[PDB]
Amino acid sequence: SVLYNSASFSTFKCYGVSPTKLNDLCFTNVYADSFVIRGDEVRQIAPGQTGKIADYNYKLPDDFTGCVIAWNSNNLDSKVGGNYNYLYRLFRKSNLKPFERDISTEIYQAGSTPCNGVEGFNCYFPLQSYGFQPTYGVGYQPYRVVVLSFELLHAPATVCGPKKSTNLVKNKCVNFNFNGLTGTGVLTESNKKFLPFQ
Amino acid sequence: ERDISTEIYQAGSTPCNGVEGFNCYFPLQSYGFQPTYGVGYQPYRVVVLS
Amino acid sequence: STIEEQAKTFLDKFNHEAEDLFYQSSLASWNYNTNITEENVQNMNNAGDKWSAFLKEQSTLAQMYPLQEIQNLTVKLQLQALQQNGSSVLSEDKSKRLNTILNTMSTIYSTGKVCCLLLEPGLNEIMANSLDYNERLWAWESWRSEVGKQLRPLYEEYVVLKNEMARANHYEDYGDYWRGDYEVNGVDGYDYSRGQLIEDVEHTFEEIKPLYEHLHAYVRAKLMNAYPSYISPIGCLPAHLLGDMWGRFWTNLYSLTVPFGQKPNIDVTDAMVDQAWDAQRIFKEAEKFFVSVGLPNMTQGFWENSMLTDPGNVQKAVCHPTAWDLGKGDFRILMCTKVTMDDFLTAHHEMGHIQYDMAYAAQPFLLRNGANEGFHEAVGEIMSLSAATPKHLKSIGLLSPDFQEDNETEINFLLKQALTIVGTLPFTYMLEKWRWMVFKGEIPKDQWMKKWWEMKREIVGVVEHDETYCDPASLFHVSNDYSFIRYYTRTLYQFQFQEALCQAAKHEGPLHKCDISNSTEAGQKLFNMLRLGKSEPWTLALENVVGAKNMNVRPLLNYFEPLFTWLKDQNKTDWSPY
């Protein structure tokens, strides 16, 4: 609920699995999947839409349960001079498998001459860095997409939505919902003692 | 029991107030049957006789 | 392997480190013209050295690739300037000598103190406003005899040096060093040629020389009174009456002519003191003007980063009227902005092109300039033309419903339109044609300056020459190697685009009263063009917007029917006061 009506996770785009309906169905495992983006990665972050980043920086089969969450981080981290802390792969050889983390650090063979020790012609780096500054344009402003992959493994789902519990009234019969116990009757105070776990 | 009106459905938290915005999307969307639509998308006529 | 893969790899490295190096180099210049300091001097020197260092070193690295082995025809569009060799091909002795030219000539242009006489605030004002025959004669003849003498070394190995490198680099002339752009020889069908531009310059000149000849009849007949024995209608004009020190400018002097002085011209300064004109103001209603055209709201950072005020003396800076394509989602206009009738035009002049900049901002860095070399300032000019319509001023706040108008308001609109921008294009015809014939070398080495009349004596009739003098290098726009063919090109494309735009807005007849507003289609189709930028030939795009691959003739008169008919009834060398 807080993420939905947070009024701060401005690009909370969960087209598909309904955040409006999430609050009763259980998932066994959820996934923290966060990176840094720019104002151009917004449209680039569109599962189904492809591009440089979708092919060489992050991975996607085509479909996965799990939303995307970005919001303006320009005020958070943007120094005059250029935010060189963050960086990005630019051009890989080809794609990879759906959804695996990669920190491959090597030299890209760009053309005819084999690299085989050389870094010059035909042998450039795909690894570049960012230079974020306060005047950066909208299409470049960092918003930090974060993913919420929900996998429901065959085992019973352990993390669930909340339980909306109201007050109990006695000496006048009601329907009742004591966690499975759903009868219909009067509840009253009682004396007979129970053991610590029954 | 039928339903004819084309009311602007409210598609989320921020109220539509009749206009677009965060989570406000128009339910009425045409088929527009183009040849590129697949067989799972090709039109089929149906008649029901109660 | 593949040319395109590492070609775009190199160009995308260039894009991503060029945002860094360029953007903060242009931004060092922004800190400079914003705050003129000396750490800016040194760091801007270093940044420009690194820019030119990428240029030279990586344009030694780029030429292991051949020129022809491309099939995409857009990779050609990027590779003309990518696979090029530059100016380091020749020896290293004329390198400090080309710097010698570009620095000593620049200094003489900036230190040409007449003894003293301050250059721009003193001479330009007295030369335009002195009003005599024996005092401005001093400032004019002393000027000529002082400037046209010492340049013979600099200019007369200047021409041969550029001609020599042109031939040495497989070109025909110093013009062929430039004109190679105008051979469209990639995608066929939409091709063009470069070898001559005599076509359509004399031809369109043979069409304006009727109109200019009527205008010249009027002007040459007007100035009878001031000099009785020196000016006659059957002869022609004297040496020093161009309204400017070279007279490059043809939209001002309605003030030395009174055919209709009875109707009050437009004035907005009364409106200025009345209706909350703030210098944070009409800029935003200029924004809603472009909305009326169909363009989105202006960015929020523009009110913050771009300077729109008076920096004052406390902030040391210079407000020269040249907008800045800072790029990288940042596009700037650093002006000492004031609220004035001409500044009113200037605001829209700059903001039209700034919107054009954000329009093609979606294009890679190498393709982030105007459509062609003349189109840049033409964007501002056409937008000023569009926003300058007076009946649209009645359609907005800065005019009263009781403001009556007649047809003679536009009469001095045009007879203004005779001495600050456009009307006498034939002077540009003279200077530019003589400049091609002198830089390219088809004239021998003591025959500049006779031609520094008789072309007047043939085209406009400005007289007093002998062999030697060399005038044409003493300008801001020639001492920095700028060619005025951009002015001819804009003078035509301005009005072809004007005709297309006003015809699209369902306004016909004469083109002096077309309002371009509430026209999404005029914005929608414009988007289909502006978004492309230089991706498509100007012939095909011109047909898409106007309807032809070549410039039209009828529209030039389609704007000018009233002045046509009004010239005919007032237009009713081989002659010497010397």
From Swiss-Prot, chain A:
**What's the impact of mutating Y88F?**
In strain: B.1.1.298
Effect of mutating T11A:
In strain: Omicron/BA.2, Omicron/BA.2.12.1, Omicron/BA.4, Omicron/BA.5, Omicron/BQ.1.1, Omicron/XBB.1.5, Omicron/EG.5.1
Region spans: Immunodominant HLA epitope recognized by the CD8+: 83-91
The observed outcome of changing K52T is: In strain: Gamma/P.1
Region (Integrin-binding motif), start-end ranges: 38-40
> What result follows from mutating N95K?
In strain: Omicron/BA.2.75, Omicron/BQ.1.1, Omicron/XBB.1.5, Omicron/EG.5.1
Chain segments carrying region Disordered = 90-125, 154-176
Please give the superkingdom of this protein's source.
Viruses
Q: How does it assemble?
A: Binds to host ACE2. RBD also interacts with the N-linked glycan on 'Asn-90' of ACE2. Cleavage of S generates a polybasic C-terminal sequence on S1 that binds to host Neuropilin-1 (NRP1) and Neuropilin-2 (NRP2) receptors. Interacts with host integrin alpha-5/beta-1 (ITGA5:ITGB1) and with ACE2 in complex with integrin alpha-5/beta-1 (ITGA5:ITGB1). May interact via cytoplasmic c-terminus with M protein. May interact (via N-terminus) with host bilirubin and biliverdin, thereby preventing antibody binding to the SARS-CoV-2 spike NTD via an allosteric mechanism.
Recorded protein name is Spike protein S1
Report the source organism.
Severe acute respiratory syndrome coronavirus 2 (2019-nCoV)
Question: Upper lineage ranks?
Answer: Viruses, Riboviria, Orthornavirae, Pisuviricota, Pisoniviricetes
Designated gene of the protein: S
Q: Which residues of the full protein are shown?
A: 366 to 563 of 1273
Swiss-Prot record, chain C:
The residues that hold substrate are: R248, H320, P321, Y487
Substituting R167D results in: No effect on interaction with SARS-CoV spike glycoprotein
Record-listed Zn(2+) binding positions: H349, H353, E377
A single Gene Ontology CC term: extracellular exosome
Coiled-coil ranges from the UniProt annotation: none
**What happens when you mutate N72Q?**
Increases slightly the interaction with RBD domain of SARS-CoV-2 spike protein
Known consequence of changing L326F?
Increases slightly the interaction with RBD domain of SARS-CoV-2 spike protein
| MF term (GO), any | zinc ion binding
- Tell me what the record says results from L61T: Increases slightly the interaction with RBD domain of SARS-CoV-2 spike protein
Report what the protein is called.
Answer: Angiotensin-converting enzyme 2
Give the stretch of the parent protein shown, with its full length. 19 to 613 of 805
